[PDB]
Design a protein around this nucleic acid. Structure first.
Length: 180
DNA sequence: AAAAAAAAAAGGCGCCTATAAAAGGGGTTTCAATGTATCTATAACCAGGCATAAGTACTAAAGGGGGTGGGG
């Protein structure tokens, strides 16, 4: 294909192994918002790497927004370090990436309804609901959002390799339905 | 002809849909079986009204004997 999808977002979970007083975290950490009435967790953001963590009373958290596996682990470590610095027996445990999202640009337009009619068992296209075509790939198990513009969204991957393999697999069919 | 107010219309801003994966708590809202006062059909209750059977007293009858008084 000659193109390599760009990783745009990585979601990871981390068990800090120790109960937390969310009310206290929200009070001593900067850039933290806590509104239990709507979500039972403290939302905290940091600038390097630019990410957002969801911290729970159970001591477990979700780190989002990271653009690489390293930034994800690194950011996760900083959040844990803050929880500690606040006064908890937090530890960096069970780090695990749960989802990777990537995007592409094949540069050419795509006749989506032709692609949907051709691959009916994998794609759901109804512009009324959503402008992009939803392609549910089997191997690897990656969901793609194909747009008329040639823009491609790939998600559902746990290894960055799946995004790459998903894109290579779809390129031929994308090319086949190129508007030209 | 002119100024004036009222109206429709535009452009811009913001947020929504479908995509994605994954760690603990507390909220309101709807629905479960199990019961008072009142309902239903039943069962059972009194007093009042008409017909049949049992007991009543009543009048009803006929049959005779005995004793006393009067007459011959």
């Amino acid at each position: 294909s000659g193109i390599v999808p760009t990783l745009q977002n990585i979601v990871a979970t981390v068990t800090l192994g120790c109960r937390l007083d969310l009310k206290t975290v929200a009070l001593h950490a900067r850039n933290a918002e806590y509104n239990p009435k709507r979500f039972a967790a403290v939302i905290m953001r940091i600038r390097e790497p630019k990410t957002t963590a969801l911290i729970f009373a159970s001591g477990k958290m979700v780190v989002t927004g990271a653009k690489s596996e390293d930034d994800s682990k690194l950011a996760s470590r900083k959040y844990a370090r803050i929880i500690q610095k606040i006064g908890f027996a937090a530890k960096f445990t069970d780090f695990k990436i749960q989802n990777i999202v990537g995007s592409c640009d094949v540069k050419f337009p795509i006749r989506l309804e032709g692609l949907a009619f051709s691959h009916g068992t994998f794609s759901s296209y109804e512009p009324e609901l959503f402008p992009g075509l939803i392609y549910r790939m089997v191997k690897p198990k990656i969901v793609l959002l194909i747009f008329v513009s040639g823009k491609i969204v790939l998600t559902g991957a746990k290894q960055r390799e799946e995004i790459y393999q998903a894109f290579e697999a779809i390129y031929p069919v994308l090319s086949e339905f190129r508007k030209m």
